Symmetry: C4
Subunit: 495 residues, 4 copies
Amino acid sequence: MQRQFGAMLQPGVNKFSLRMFGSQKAVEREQERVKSAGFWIIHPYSDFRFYWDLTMLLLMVGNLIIIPVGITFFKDENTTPWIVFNVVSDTFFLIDLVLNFRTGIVVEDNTEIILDPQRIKMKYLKSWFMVDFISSIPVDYIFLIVETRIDSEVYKTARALRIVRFTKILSLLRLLRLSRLIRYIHQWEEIFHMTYDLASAVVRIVNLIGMMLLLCHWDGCLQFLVPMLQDFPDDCWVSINNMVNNSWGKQYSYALFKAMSHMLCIGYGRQAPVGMSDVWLTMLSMIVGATCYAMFIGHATALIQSLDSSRRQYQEKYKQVEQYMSFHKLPPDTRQRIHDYYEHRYQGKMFDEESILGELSEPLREEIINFNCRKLVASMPLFANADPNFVTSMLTKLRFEVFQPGDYIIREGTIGKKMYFIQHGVVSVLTKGNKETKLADGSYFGEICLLTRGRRTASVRADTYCRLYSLSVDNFNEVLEEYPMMRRAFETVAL
Amino acid sequence: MQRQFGAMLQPGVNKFSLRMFGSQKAVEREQERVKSAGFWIIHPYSDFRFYWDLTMLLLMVGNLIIIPVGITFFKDENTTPWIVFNVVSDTFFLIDLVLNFRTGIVVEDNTEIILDPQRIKMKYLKSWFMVDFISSIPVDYIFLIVETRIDSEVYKTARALRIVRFTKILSLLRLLRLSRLIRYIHQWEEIFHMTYDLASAVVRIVNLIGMMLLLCHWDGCLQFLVPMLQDFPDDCWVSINNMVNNSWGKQYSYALFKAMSHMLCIGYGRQAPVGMSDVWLTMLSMIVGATCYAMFIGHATALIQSLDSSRRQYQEKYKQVEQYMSFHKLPPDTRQRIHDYYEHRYQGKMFDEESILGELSEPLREEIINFNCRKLVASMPLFANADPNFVTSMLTKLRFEVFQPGDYIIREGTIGKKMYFIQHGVVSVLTKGNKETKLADGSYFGEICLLTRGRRTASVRADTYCRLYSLSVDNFNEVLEEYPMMRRAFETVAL
Amino acid sequence: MQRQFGAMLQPGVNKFSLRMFGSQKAVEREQERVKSAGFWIIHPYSDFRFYWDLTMLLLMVGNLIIIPVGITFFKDENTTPWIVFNVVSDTFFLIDLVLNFRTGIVVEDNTEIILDPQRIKMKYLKSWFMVDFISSIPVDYIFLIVETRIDSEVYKTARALRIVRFTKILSLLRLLRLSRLIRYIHQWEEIFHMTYDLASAVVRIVNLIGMMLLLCHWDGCLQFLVPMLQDFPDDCWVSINNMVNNSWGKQYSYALFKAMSHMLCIGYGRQAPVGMSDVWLTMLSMIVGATCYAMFIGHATALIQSLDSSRRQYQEKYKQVEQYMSFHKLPPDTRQRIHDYYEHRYQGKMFDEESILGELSEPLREEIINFNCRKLVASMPLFANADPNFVTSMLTKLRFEVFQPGDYIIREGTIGKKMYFIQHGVVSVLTKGNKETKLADGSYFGEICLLTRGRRTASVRADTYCRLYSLSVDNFNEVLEEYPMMRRAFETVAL
Amino acid sequence: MQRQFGAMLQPGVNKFSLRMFGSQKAVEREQERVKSAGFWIIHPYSDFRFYWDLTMLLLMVGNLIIIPVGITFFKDENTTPWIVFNVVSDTFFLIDLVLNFRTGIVVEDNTEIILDPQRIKMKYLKSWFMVDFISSIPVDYIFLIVETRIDSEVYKTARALRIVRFTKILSLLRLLRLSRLIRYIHQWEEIFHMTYDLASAVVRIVNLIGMMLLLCHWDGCLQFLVPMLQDFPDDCWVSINNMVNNSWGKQYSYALFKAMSHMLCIGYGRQAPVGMSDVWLTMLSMIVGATCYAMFIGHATALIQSLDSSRRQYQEKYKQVEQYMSFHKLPPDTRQRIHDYYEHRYQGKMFDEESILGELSEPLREEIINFNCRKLVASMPLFANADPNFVTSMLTKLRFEVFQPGDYIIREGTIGKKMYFIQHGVVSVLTKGNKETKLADGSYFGEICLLTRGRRTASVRADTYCRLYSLSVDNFNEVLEEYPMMRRAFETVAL
């Protein structure tokens, strides 16, 4: 299958490519730009790069956990499965270092992914080649093989002891795979922000919890490593606690306890540090742990301030309204009225209807307005015998309004300028002759002033917290400007 | 009373139901939807569900406090009132587990509360049945009765010791009632946000203080439990402190001290942990306590940033104005003038008058404007002999303005465009002939240019920080457009 | 002087009364409302209430510091200057308790200060009378005198030892003066927010530092008090450290060290607590100190987020612009252009010119616009021979604009719509015949299209980051609408 | 070179001077104001002041690190290179104190840098002369020389021991160079905010990390100094740890460990403090360290809340939209539609197109609109045969719109009001006769209603997430108002 390998390196059409490049035609143009690049160029949004980086993350986490425990706590680090594990890992990392010479580079300074095979080489050499080249090759086995090639009988004096100490130091160059771990996790978390829309504070605090666990683990390995390379002098914390000859589990547990004690701000180990190794290592672990815990408090605060943002914005708005009422020295009755109005208008959380209906497109706006109000405008017989385009063009002019119980919605004797549709609540129509009718949901009132443009003949008082839709006369005239046939029909039926 | 039991399960008309469903008719429709559901379906907004969940919270808090202390610190946990307490509690929790098969489920993805008796079953089995079924039945007494049914003489060897240890482990399955505690507290705190409008940061920090006390209590019980199940070896913290045979109060006090020491970032107990049980338990308590204390700092910061939000927004606005003055390199005299203006305009706290008067309804706007200005427009004799509808339609066009002492409010010789009403402050009218009159609160000036639309004939200088209301000529013409009779009356009286 | 005492109780005219009540007439009305209240009613904004509360704060701070140290660390608390100090203090506090029956109460629910002498009595009894009545009277000396009146020879048995312990407990009822301390400090800090405009975060963090010092001091006194009332048993921290018989300075130093160690998250004292007194007292001090330190981190964060608010808002705006450029996939050259434009437009800090000039009054707006631009519009000979009212009405229509070097400010061949005035920068005018002139500060260009309304005849390219003022043709026509004489003059001179 | 020295003191034309003073002419005016000031006045924005302050910072950091270690840990502080180092340092600081009498003072209350040689003297004496005069002169060597001049044989009794103690105390007056360090670092960091636009939180947290390291270093020196001046009594921490006679490296390491332990909230040293020196010094270090660490948590939180500000603002906006959908009780299908629309409109991050295009200048707006849309309007044959000024004036009226798949972009039978250009996506044109054509990127539709102003004849449905540009009929008429020749050409070609 010489075509399937060429297909997997190219960025396939998925949710991510359609969201990045915009159209399917742009993704096909990107596939053609990968095709015209050269000999087997890997695009960093493909499927092969994804599954390869997934296997590399599942290998790097295991390497960064297993390798310091294998180096520091065990004495003979030349057993057969340990060498097998290191050689298999370094084989995968050399394969990844070769494949980095064929992967495109996503630059955040443009929308142009670099696919020039010479320019990716001249960028990867100038950016991240030295770290990956150190962390890929087994420098310790190179030093061991070269030292035994120089002297096959090197174990005569205590110089071979220094060779073993320097082997254990050079084998910590495999901890520079953290750079590739960080660069792969950021590169795929940006993609998963683009696709799935997860909260940014959750992602950053998961990243920080991962780094805190990894640094606590490395510091716990380090505070046993440095007394181990000094052959456990009588002032290190290992020999003071008489735990030189315990099992490696107890050594790792108590060392990780020292690291976590100086990380989460508790302290100490058994006693205070004594030797000059332990004092400076404890100060290093204290600096690293206090920095990581301060950043954890920062990410937790940024997470908590995004949980109730709408209700927080509501309370900021209502404190501004409290200041407005205090500035003009309003009586407390009106303050109770305004408080009840904001409790029954926004229901404790802030939203701006005008900006939200402005940001939406046209069919979503029409769909929301239809679902809200077409069941109400169908109940009026002036509108059921008209153009559906007239109704659709008229529904945009409705305004949502809220009235408290006791309010005069329509005061009798004024110029009628608005027509009201009832969504929720019960109103009372007072007319002359001491007649008081009740209107409820799905009803309407104030329609004579729309047609005739006269004055008010009856009062309307709200009895509950009424949610109403309003239609002005001027907006109705603007709707009649485009539809003159229904205007002439209203002129004839008005006769 | 076969009708009262059917009435209490249905959501009664209260402040909460009227605020959720909107109208009383919608609440009656919800009552009919509960009635047409099936055999005795409980609606989760009712009164019976409220008093039942209140009794369950008052039982769960007592259970989660008493049960770990009864398990870990006491030896013979088969005394009579302890068994009575457990059986009465588990009877109530089985009754609650049965009643969960008849409670509706409030889904936050819609406004449709599920009342289908088969769909609530198929949702509760797929969501939260296993946890409540474990935490309801006394699994420990089942294991004890079944073990004694298998072997009535099981106390011969030390196998019964293992049976008692496993009984004390299985009796901690009653601590999964925390799930029902959390789900009931969130479900009723959402309702009490809807009704009473309490600050969200206060509610969340009370929730966090509750969880911190409960986790400190459970960790204090755990750090005595795990050395107790190992029959107190000579490396646990209990036998090192020689407090195996103290009273249970001293044991609980010092264990809760260890838990709270590793929670509020202090440490340690007496000495550092020694055995492998204590090291990993101390690391667990350190992780839990550091996480809870970091979240406490986060909630405290989110609480503190909501206390002076209006004054903080004022200071952000004034720092923007300081940058505006620094950008155009204004002289310091004008900077002192602008500083005094913002001190005497907003009085240290930010509020936007135009947006607030826009967000309100029509009668509240009319009520605020009447209380502010009808005592001022009644003092002008041009307006006392006019339509009250004219005055009411004109009062909307007033604008609030503030002038510093030394300002020329009206400069003589310009086109008169505004008319000013005095709320607070004393102004000086300078005219020709070196005549300087003083005007004060309730007075007015600049009314000749409203009627005649000519030019200015006298200067007006502010002597104090004057709060004034202004009325433009163009807005007055717009008010006269709708009321032509008062316009003709002003034409006749102007003659 | 029977008039001076009546004058000092009334709120004098100062910066504070003029800012609260608005006008001097309102302050005189408040003085008349104090006069018509009754027999010597004290207004809480007066001068006497200020100097009285100042002396009470300077007495309460001394009492709350001296009294616990005198109670806990000294044995014979019946020496003569100690009794003199307590009697003089309690005399002042009884005088303050009497004067609280004549002080008005500032209610935050209205702008109406209560001055009814019966209603202030019925509010002060229902609000804060019990705490002040306990903290005012010397309950310890009452108990001592009554106990010696009951039995004059009470020192026979060890019952008098219990009497002395109960005397030292009852003498801590003087620590309820903290309520009056808090209520006076909030009441005058609100007034000093109103007058002097100090940052709110600074005031709240000074309040919190005061409470942290006072609670650390009280906890240090308490952790010596409770072992002292138990006659120093052999498990308290005092007898373990062999510091029962040291001087009181060393006892207070080490006790305050224990309190501050459990406050600022360090711990412990010498060893872990042992007795059941010390364990629960250490847990109490840990809870209080961890709460106070978490609130200190919260107030420090709220202080730090208000230091660079303008530059933070600038960076939020520029990150939105970076997202806008990333969304339309703009080339990097235009991104560098937009970056240079925002560096040379806002200079790293956000300010909105239109909203700031809208919020100001009319003379400040005229003063800023005159200082910015009258030196520029005087240099044009079309405007120096015109009405100063014409210039003043025209200057409002100028717009501030910024052009990068390389930009074509005027492109030749278009419809001339704007006229440009130069504030800063050097532009190049290119015309036909390959002629390139340089214009600099105080010059102007594009004035022929203002008069004639034709087309462009020469190009203008910016050579530096030019700050310019612009004047449109349509705004110039709007200025000519009100001033027809200068329009006719421009018609004649244009001929 | 008598001219080069006069040139270097004057502010040269660079990026900073051109950004501050605005124009090169203003910088030449500032050079003339420096020239007409007096005898060799140094301007604080020059090059000489920059390189001088750079050498002073590189000297002050070395002095504040070396001087306390040389004072506290070494016994004979009169060796030759130590005296050479102090005399060379104090010579440079006296030269700097002389040069402060010739440096201008940048005042933040205006844009006028003070260059009056008498007024800079009378400001520097009243502001910062005493601190710099103490920190410049070697007060310790003055006291030593004067004491030996008074008595040449002063080493007879133990009074010379007191002289040496007082010499080591007075030699800590060189630590008042911290004032000049802070005043130089703020003065140049303001300038580097003006030039290079680095994030403010990064700069403030680097400043705080510097102060935390310096205060930890000084506290570590102090907690050895105060036991050293008491000749190491048997209750200090030095003699308890038996480390009086160790090397100075071990003493400094363990003292810095005590300071850092009480700074990063860990504690203690070996044991608790015992003597009254150590208790109060430990309380001082605890207060300083807890304050610095709380400010570090504050700066870290302010840094973290500025990292994802755009995505945070997007999530706040979408939570407001979730509240809007919950308020009107929309069905979940429309909620999924609105969620998909905001995922495909803003792509997870908030930006406001209208405000951003309003804030830009005219050529940047034209350049962005040309790059977005001139490749689209060139493909329409109605526009390729027209004025390029017509196209340039018309391109401003395009609006960016986004449609979901399934939406009817054009519904057949309505009044045609808009014309649509396709940027991304594939649409389907349905017409009568069951004909369905596909249009893609670079195509256009709905142009007949622009010319004729009739009704719709075919439906257009979106099949993908289409990004379109729209052009209304009314905006097209407004474009034709200014260009009547192309309007007449469209009238003729429309025939």
